[PDB]
Amino acid sequence: DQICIGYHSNNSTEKVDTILERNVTVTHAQDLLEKTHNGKLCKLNGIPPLELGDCSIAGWLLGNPECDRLLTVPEWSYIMEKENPRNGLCYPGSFNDYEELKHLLSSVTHFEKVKILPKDRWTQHTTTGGSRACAVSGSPSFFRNMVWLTKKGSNYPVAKGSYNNTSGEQMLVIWGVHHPNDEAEQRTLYQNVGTYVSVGTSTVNKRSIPEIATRPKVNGQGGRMEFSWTILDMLDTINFESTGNLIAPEYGFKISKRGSSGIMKTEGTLENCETKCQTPLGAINTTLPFHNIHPLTIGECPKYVKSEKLVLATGLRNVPQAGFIEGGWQGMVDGWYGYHHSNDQGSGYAADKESTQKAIDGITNKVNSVIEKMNTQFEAVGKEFSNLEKRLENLNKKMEDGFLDVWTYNAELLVLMENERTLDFHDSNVKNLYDKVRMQLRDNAKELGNGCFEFYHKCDDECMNSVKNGTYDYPKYEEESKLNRNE
Amino acid sequence: DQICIGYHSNNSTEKVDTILERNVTVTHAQDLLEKTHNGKLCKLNGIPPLELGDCSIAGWLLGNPECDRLLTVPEWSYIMEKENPRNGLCYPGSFNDYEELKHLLSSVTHFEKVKILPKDRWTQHTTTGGSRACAVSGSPSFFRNMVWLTKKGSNYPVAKGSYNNTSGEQMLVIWGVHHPNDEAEQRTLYQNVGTYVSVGTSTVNKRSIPEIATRPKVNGQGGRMEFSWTILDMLDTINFESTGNLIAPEYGFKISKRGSSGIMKTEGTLENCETKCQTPLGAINTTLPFHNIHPLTIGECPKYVKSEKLVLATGLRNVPGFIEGGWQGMVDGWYGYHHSNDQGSGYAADKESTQKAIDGITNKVNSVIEKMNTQFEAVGKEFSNLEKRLENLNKKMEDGFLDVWTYNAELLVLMENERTLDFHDSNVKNLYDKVRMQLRDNAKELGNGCFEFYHKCDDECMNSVKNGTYDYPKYEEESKLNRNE
Amino acid sequence: DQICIGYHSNNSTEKVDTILERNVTVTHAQDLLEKTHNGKLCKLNGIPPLELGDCSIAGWLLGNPECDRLLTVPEWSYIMEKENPRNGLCYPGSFNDYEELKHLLSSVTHFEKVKILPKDRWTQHTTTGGSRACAVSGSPSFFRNMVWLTKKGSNYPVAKGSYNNTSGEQMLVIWGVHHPNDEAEQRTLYQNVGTYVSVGTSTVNKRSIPEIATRPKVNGQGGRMEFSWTILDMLDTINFESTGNLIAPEYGFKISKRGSSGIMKTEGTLENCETKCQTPLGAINTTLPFHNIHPLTIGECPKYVKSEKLVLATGLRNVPGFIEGGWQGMVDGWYGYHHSNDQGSGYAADKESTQKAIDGITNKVNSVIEKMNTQFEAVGKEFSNLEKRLENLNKKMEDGFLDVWTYNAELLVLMENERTLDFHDSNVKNLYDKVRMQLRDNAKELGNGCFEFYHKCDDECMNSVKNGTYDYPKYEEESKLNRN
Ligand SMILES: CC(=O)N[C@H]1[C@H]([C@H](O)[C@H](O)CO)O[C@@](OC[C@H]2O[C@@H](O)[C@H](O)[C@@H](O)[C@H]2O)(C(=O)O)C[C@@H]1O
Ligand SMILES: CC(=O)N[C@H]1[C@H]([C@H](O)[C@H](O)CO)O[C@@](OC[C@H]2O[C@@H](O)[C@H](O)[C@@H](O)[C@H]2O)(C(=O)O)C[C@@H]1O
Ligand SMILES: *[C@@H]1O[C@H](CO)[C@@H](O[C@@H]2O[C@H](CO)[C@@H](O)[C@H](O)[C@H]2NC(C)=O)[C@H](O)[C@H]1NC(C)=O
Ligand SMILES: *[C@@H]1O[C@H](CO)[C@@H](O[C@@H]2O[C@H](CO)[C@@H](O)[C@H](O)[C@H]2NC(C)=O)[C@H](O)[C@H]1NC(C)=O
Ligand SMILES: *[C@@H]1O[C@H](CO)[C@@H](O[C@@H]2O[C@H](CO)[C@@H](O)[C@H](O)[C@H]2NC(C)=O)[C@H](O)[C@H]1NC(C)=O
Ligand SMILES: CC(=O)N[C@H]1[C@H]([C@H](O)[C@H](O)CO)O[C@@](O)(C(=O)O)C[C@@H]1O
Ligand SMILES: *[C@@H]1O[C@H](CO)[C@@H](O)[C@H](O)[C@H]1NC(C)=O
Numbered sequence A: 001d002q003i004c005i006g007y008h009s010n011n012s013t014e015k016v017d018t019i020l021e022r023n024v025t026v027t028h029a030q031d032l033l034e035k036t037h038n039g040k041l042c043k044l045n046g047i048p049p050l051e052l053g054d055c056s057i058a059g060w061l062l063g064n065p066e067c068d069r070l071l072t073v074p075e076w077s078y079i080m081e082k083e084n085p086r087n088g089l090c091y092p093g094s095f096n097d098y099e100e101l102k103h104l105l106s107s108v109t110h111f112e113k114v115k116i117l118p119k120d121r122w123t124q125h126t127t128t129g130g131s132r133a134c135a136v137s138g139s140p141s142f143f144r145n146m147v148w149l150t151k152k153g154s155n156y157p158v159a160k161g162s163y164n165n166t167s168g169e170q171m172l173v174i175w176g177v178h179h180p181n182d183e184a185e186q187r188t189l190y191q192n193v194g195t196y197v198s199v200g201t202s203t204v205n206k207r208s209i210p211e212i213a214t215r216p217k218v219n220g221q222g223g224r225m226e227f228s229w230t231i232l233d234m235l236d237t238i239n240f241e242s243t244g245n246l247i248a249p250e251y252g253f254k255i256s257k258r259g260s261s262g263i264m265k266t267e268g269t270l271e272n273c274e275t276k277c278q279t280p281l282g283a284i285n286t287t288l289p290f291h292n293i294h295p296l297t298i299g300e301c302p303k304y305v306k307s308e309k310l311v312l313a314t315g316l317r318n319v320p321q322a323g324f325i326e327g328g329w330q331g332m333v334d335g336w337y338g339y340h341h342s343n344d345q346g347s348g349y350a351a352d353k354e355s356t357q358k359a360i361d362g363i364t365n366k367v368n369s370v371i372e373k374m375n376t377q378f379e380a381v382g383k384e385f386s387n388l389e390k391r392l393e394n395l396n397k398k399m400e401d402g403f404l405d406v407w408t409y410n411a412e413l414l415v416l417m418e419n420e421r422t423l424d425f426h427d428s429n430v431k432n433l434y435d436k437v438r439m440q441l442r443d444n445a446k447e448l449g450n451g452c453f454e455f456y457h458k459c460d461d462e463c464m465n466s467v468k469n470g471t472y473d474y475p476k477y478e479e480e481s482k483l484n485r486n487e
Numbered sequence B: 001d002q003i004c005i006g007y008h009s010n011n012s013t014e015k016v017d018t019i020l021e022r023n024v025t026v027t028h029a030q031d032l033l034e035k036t037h038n039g040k041l042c043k044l045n046g047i048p049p050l051e052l053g054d055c056s057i058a059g060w061l062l063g064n065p066e067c068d069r070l071l072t073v074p075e076w077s078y079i080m081e082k083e084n085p086r087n088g089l090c091y092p093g094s095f096n097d098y099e100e101l102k103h104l105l106s107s108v109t110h111f112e113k114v115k116i117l118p119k120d121r122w123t124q125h126t127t128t129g130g131s132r133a134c135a136v137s138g139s140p141s142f143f144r145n146m147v148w149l150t151k152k153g154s155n156y157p158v159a160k161g162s163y164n165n166t167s168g169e170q171m172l173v174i175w176g177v178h179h180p181n182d183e184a185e186q187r188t189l190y191q192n193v194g195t196y197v198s199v200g201t202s203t204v205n206k207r208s209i210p211e212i213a214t215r216p217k218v219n220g221q222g223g224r225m226e227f228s229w230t231i232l233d234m235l236d237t238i239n240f241e242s243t244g245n246l247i248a249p250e251y252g253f254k255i256s257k258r259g260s261s262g263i264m265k266t267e268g269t270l271e272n273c274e275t276k277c278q279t280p281l282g283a284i285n286t287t288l289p290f291h292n293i294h295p296l297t298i299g300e301c302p303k304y305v306k307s308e309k310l311v312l313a314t315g316l317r318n319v320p321g322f323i324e325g326g327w328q329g330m331v332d333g334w335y336g337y338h339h340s341n342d343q344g345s346g347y348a349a350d351k352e353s354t355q356k357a358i359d360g361i362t363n364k365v366n367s368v369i370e371k372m373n374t375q376f377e378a379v380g381k382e383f384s385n386l387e388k389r390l391e392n393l394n395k396k397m398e399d400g401f402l403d404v405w406t407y408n409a410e411l412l413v414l415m416e417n418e419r420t421l422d423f424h425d426s427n428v429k430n431l432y433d434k435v436r437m438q439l440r441d442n443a444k445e446l447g448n449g450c451f452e453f454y455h456k457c458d459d460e461c462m463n464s465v466k467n468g469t470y471d472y473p474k475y476e477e478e479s480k481l482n483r484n485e
Numbered sequence C: 001d002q003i004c005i006g007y008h009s010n011n012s013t014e015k016v017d018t019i020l021e022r023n024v025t026v027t028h029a030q031d032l033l034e035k036t037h038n039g040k041l042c043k044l045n046g047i048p049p050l051e052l053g054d055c056s057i058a059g060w061l062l063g064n065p066e067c068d069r070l071l072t073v074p075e076w077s078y079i080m081e082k083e084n085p086r087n088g089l090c091y092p093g094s095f096n097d098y099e100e101l102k103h104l105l106s107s108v109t110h111f112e113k114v115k116i117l118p119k120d121r122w123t124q125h126t127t128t129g130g131s132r133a134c135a136v137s138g139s140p141s142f143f144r145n146m147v148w149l150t151k152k153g154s155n156y157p158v159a160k161g162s163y164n165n166t167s168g169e170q171m172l173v174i175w176g177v178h179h180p181n182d183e184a185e186q187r188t189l190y191q192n193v194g195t196y197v198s199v200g201t202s203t204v205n206k207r208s209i210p211e212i213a214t215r216p217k218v219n220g221q222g223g224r225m226e227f228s229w230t231i232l233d234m235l236d237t238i239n240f241e242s243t244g245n246l247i248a249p250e251y252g253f254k255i256s257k258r259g260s261s262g263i264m265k266t267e268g269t270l271e272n273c274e275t276k277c278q279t280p281l282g283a284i285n286t287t288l289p290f291h292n293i294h295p296l297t298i299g300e301c302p303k304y305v306k307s308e309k310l311v312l313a314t315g316l317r318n319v320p321g322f323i324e325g326g327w328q329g330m331v332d333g334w335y336g337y338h339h340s341n342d343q344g345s346g347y348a349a350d351k352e353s354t355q356k357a358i359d360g361i362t363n364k365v366n367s368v369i370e371k372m373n374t375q376f377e378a379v380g381k382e383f384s385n386l387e388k389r390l391e392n393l394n395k396k397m398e399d400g401f402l403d404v405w406t407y408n409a410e411l412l413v414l415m416e417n418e419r420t421l422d423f424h425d426s427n428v429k430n431l432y433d434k435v436r437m438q439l440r441d442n443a444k445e446l447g448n449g450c451f452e453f454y455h456k457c458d459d460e461c462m463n464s465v466k467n468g469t470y471d472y473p474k475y476e477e478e479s480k481l482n483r484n
């Protein structure tokens, strides 16, 4: 006739950390952080990305001779570009608002080349110009998308061109103006002086004047070229007029499948896989709600935290050794709480039903809640800046770092707090069960000193299950117990 | 014959949430989130706002003929403007640094129109130009503040004008340049080519050259007009000089009564009402410290939280001895002192514990309100179509800060709810075992959170017991004699 | 033959705060905030700063005659500059991208002046020009680092100049263009009209045109000057070419020592002392991990929080058995174990719970001071008069982040205080109930929180029950006999 209280223990070895103690041991724990990747660039949802190779965005758009494989591109999901591309602008020059164009391009998925000004339409000029900088097989050449207008014979008639956008979507147009290096070159190229280039649309008004100066040679050239761009609207019209130094476009780019994408800076190549999201260092395939690989990602993946370990305790403090004051019992595999019984006719290792289910519900509800709360984390997006906007770059970097630090601190503190609370709740529950049993057993027994007491009158297995069900009736057979303790 | 401990209960049915479980019932609860608005736009401390109606800011400033009701404007409190006003620039063109002007205007309450350059002072030019773009009653017209200088006869003498700012406050001046669409138009208008417009002050020095090209027709016009602005200082002067294509001003705006204001983006209309803080969706009249209507407000108004429920539990768990449930028969205090003597009974309560309980919860609520008084407040801003990066940066800033503060508020509320519940349980248990310890062994524990007094006594006995002055040597001998049986 | 449980008490009168009540007296408390300073500016790590005085950055770089002390400058640590310097541009004008230049200069520790275009090389023009705006001792003068080119006789031949950067590091070059105020002045100064100034490098291409207009008189002059700057790279070349209105440079600045520094907008003068961190109000020499002096600091120094009190408790709640209050005579540990046998008494304390309490306190202190080590730092910046939106956005940045971090710190310390007090109470109660549990029933609880013993034990009994080695079946027959 003996019953005692304890808890289930096993041979686990995982460890967790709390606000007051470190590397403490627990019965069951669940990880929350993913830190492995396959280290490859692979397809996203079956749509292979666009591999720029050695070229650059400007080289691809203008049609550099080297980038001959990019004359027609299918749909893509993200753009892969190197850090310092080689084949950029073959003829030296610049590009106004490069970074704005890149930011706009970041959210475009497909393109469509449209011929807006056929080359042969210029019947009063020369259109076969080319330089040695952009040369193939020794012979000079030029970009594949623009036309160089030079005087034919000995005169340069005024050049006029216009287009009405009836394609069906917004169009992107690029044009350029050439700056010579000395007056003799200007005279022998355009047979005029003091020329101008004027571009007009419904909302854009521009008029540029070529500049002549002496500059250091780049790629064996003393000249320069300056390019500009604009977004042509629906049913609008753009007008071209110049007296020289004009680089007219020959193709227009029409946005067709505007979606969500990004630009990724890496040096890798393209493999054959299929992931759910991509990272510059590789691809991630996991279900945990956290990762610490790289702050910039494309697709869908868990949040990024700048930590290294995040372990959530969901069990008892494993303290292996017939009572709860010495430790748990290895023989308990059914429930989480000890209700060991030992009658005269036999013993048993029963558990308590009420406590186990409430504990299970509490822990699963709390796990769901802690997962759910952090769903509003901050996310980062790549951006570009020129060399005259250092303040903006500093501001952007500070934003990213500050928000990442704040969220990291929040998550770590929450996890440590939760571990501590879980341990305290479990131990509180164990004393709660014990003293509930003690008051239920109105005297009639003495504590041996092993966290449990021995009954002073002989009950039976019916009495055991009656006490277990919280249905013990003290005045029912109290007289025999009184007689026994009278001894 | 015995006394028992319990706690007061009632029939309230409000629900709160905590970290461990959700949707639990407490006797008394408080609310912190306000989520109702009257859906109207009205005054602000008796100062009606400025209702631009169907005009944009540029149209009002330049003096578009449509916005003829805004020629003179009294003091205002905030400015209401539609998303895409119809009457903006009648003559097609552009405005330089529009967004900076709007941001500067966001913190000015009153204006004052001052005539600086009288129209009749130009005695060597023609000042009756106009166009069909800004036409009233069929006849061509122009803006009501600028002057279009054209050639008189067949010559265009150089134009000179100046003004010295002695008004007594900073001034705002606007001028403009005109770009024709062909050489013949320029020759017909100004008789000369290769002209220029020069503007010079003590700090700003500028010079523009008119540009000629062919453009698509907008509003039936091929030309364009470019406008620029500057701020004059006290006791400063500004000099105008040009040979053509000059759009001279006639009125300067003097800044008086600088204060705090804003720009409001809505399609509503002013009504007859009074409020204390205003939102794009309506007014707010409440004393709670939180709301979730709209992030942009004007005037003093509670903090904004992107959530939907915020309830602070200040009571006990509701259930129907203290181990079986509470008692509805107790309303004076909080904790149970069910007394039942031989000659009577009672439902007294511990007045002492109630005092520390109520002051604790009150200062807790006050502190919780206090900690979040330093919230982050958003401010409206405007960006052109060439600063998408800046606009994205600003939007990300706002969303990040709002999310951070929302998370903080929710976590704090849950923490406090759990702490309060555990605290109340702790005081109940502490009172129980303290009473048991004071009573020592001169009784028998009935096992129902109540022990039956074993020593016989009148009201003085347990009166001293609740007073904490129970004397063991008073009734140890008789109790021992009785329990010896 | 009696024992009782208690806790050590002292006479300390330091009050702490918590989320439940205010101004609670404790036994031992720490501090984490520093709020004092010497109110002086002096050397950082033994390297004196650069003291501009009354000259702005432009005045120093161009070589204003007033700032003659700054012709040669040694290494520095940070730059001291008044908010509205007087001796700026002696000749009225402007500067292109002034703020970008200041931001770039914020991270440079030493310069090096190199003569790239000697003055006498211009043999076809006149280089003795000067104005009354920058006048020393009555006679007209000019900037010390620029050359003004005028007509030579009655002709202005085309001016050309070039320089190849072989110095060995990145160089900074400054040039300028002159805007007259009337046509007669332009003719009498340069003999030509419709001139231009052209500057060309491997990356920068520019061509400006002088502008003529009427302007108000500033400093007695109606003209204006416009300056620009660029960064010359390794083995690059810069070409100058103009036909008038050119302000050619004479010295090039070479970036020698690159490091970390900043610009401080102060008003005082350099003093003679040493420090490790510097703030616009004074120097800080402490070891606590927080301060509330000024958001902008230079060097290494604790973090900035916008609070007024951060007190951490690390001891029992001070209050004069354990139910009556503390023990003034307990000076050994933290949990009393009062021993009193028939032959004598004792004041032994528990040496077990003390060590775990101490190590837990140390662990929590380290954790709290370590969690915030990844805080946010503020860096000074400057914005022009047409970038109000940028300045507003920067201010909102700084204020928001500071508020977030100070709120987090206060919340953490309050929770820590609550947990510590509750933990100590739990420890003492647990010790008492554990002692009672081992005692079994051979004593009667007097009511002072401790029980008078039943059967006459001795010092061996006393130390055995102290060690948790009591054996109830060993010696209880005497208790049973005397129970009657
Ligand atoms: C229409 C055209 O392409 N013309 C020239 C072109 C231009 O004259 C100029 O180079 C543009 O910047 O240059 C090309 O020949 C260049 C050649 O010109 C000599 O005069 C000079 O001495 C050489 O050093 C070299 O620059 C070219 O390949 O760039 C093509 C064509 O002759
Ligand atoms: C001084 C003035 O305002 N004159 C004209 C003005 C200008 O001549 C010019 O059009 C503004 O850019 O324009 C207006 O008249 C011109 C009108 O002439 C028709 O023949 C033509 O078909 C129209 O497109 C238009 O150019 C005008 O209506 O804009 C008014 C004024 O007489
Ligand atoms: C560009 O093409 C569109 C499409 O034809 C032109 O819009 C038409 O204009 C005529 C006016 O002569 C109207 O009768 C049609 O109804 C318009 N079409 C539509 C679909 O609205 C537009 O005018 C052209 N652009 C220019 C500058 O002429
Ligand atoms: C603009 O008006 C102001 C005020 O009339 C002029 O300032 C005065 O200038 C004279 C010239 O010596 C001084 O004697 C006065 O003391 C000035 N007034 C004050 C109040 O100080 C100013 O000169 C005028 N601007 C111009 C360009 O003449
Ligand atoms: C500036 O000076 C450098 C240093 O001499 C020049 O670089 C040399 O150029 C010649 C070409 O004739 C090469 O043979 C040398 O090997 C280069 N030197 C080094 C160290 O690489 C440079 O060319 C000069 N700048 C210009 C525009 O000529
Ligand atoms: C080469 C030169 O410096 N010339 C003269 C200049 C110019 O003529 C203009 O004034 C400059 O804008 O002006 C002064 O007369 C003057 O008033 O200080 C000084 C000098 O005699
Ligand atoms: C722990 O016990 C389980 C029980 O099945 C067993 O499989 C496992 O090997 C044990 N681990 C060790 C390290 O013995």
Ligand SMILES: *[C@@H]1O[C@H](CO)[C@@H](O)[C@H](O)[C@H]1NC(C)=O
Pocket (backbone or CB within 6 Å): A022, A023
């Ligand atoms: C104890 O915890 C620390 C973390 O502070 C850890 O580095 C160490 O490995 C742990 N001890 C053991 C035996 O794992």
Ligand SMILES: *[C@@H]1O[C@H](CO)[C@@H](O)[C@H](O)[C@H]1NC(C)=O
Pocket (backbone or CB within 6 Å): A274, A275, A285, A286
């Ligand atoms: C991702 O991992 C799961 C197992 O964790 C596997 O079943 C699945 O095939 C993986 N996905 C890919 C694309 O390899």
Ligand SMILES: *[C@@H]1O[C@H](CO)[C@@H](O)[C@H](O)[C@H]1NC(C)=O
Pocket (backbone or CB within 6 Å): B022, B023
């Ligand atoms: C209370 O909240 C719980 C949360 O799971 C929900 O299941 C339950 O339906 C809610 N009760 C009511 C009455 O809405």
Ligand SMILES: *[C@@H]1O[C@H](CO)[C@@H](O)[C@H](O)[C@H]1NC(C)=O
Pocket (backbone or CB within 6 Å): B274, B275, B285, B286
């Ligand atoms: C706001 O509501 C209270 C509630 O009674 C009312 O007394 C008060 O008049 C209201 N405010 C205004 C401006 O009407």
Ligand SMILES: *[C@@H]1O[C@H](CO)[C@@H](O)[C@H](O)[C@H]1NC(C)=O
Pocket (backbone or CB within 6 Å): C022, C023
């Ligand atoms: C301690 O703090 C409380 C805050 O409620 C304040 O009322 C009291 O005056 C403070 N003590 C002293 C000595 O100022």
Ligand SMILES: *[C@@H]1O[C@H](CO)[C@@H](O)[C@H](O)[C@H]1NC(C)=O
Pocket (backbone or CB within 6 Å): C274, C275, C285, C286
């Ligand atoms: C900083 O304070 C400590 C405190 O004693 C002192 O020893 C040290 O000399 C101080 N440092 C300086 C530079 O004065």
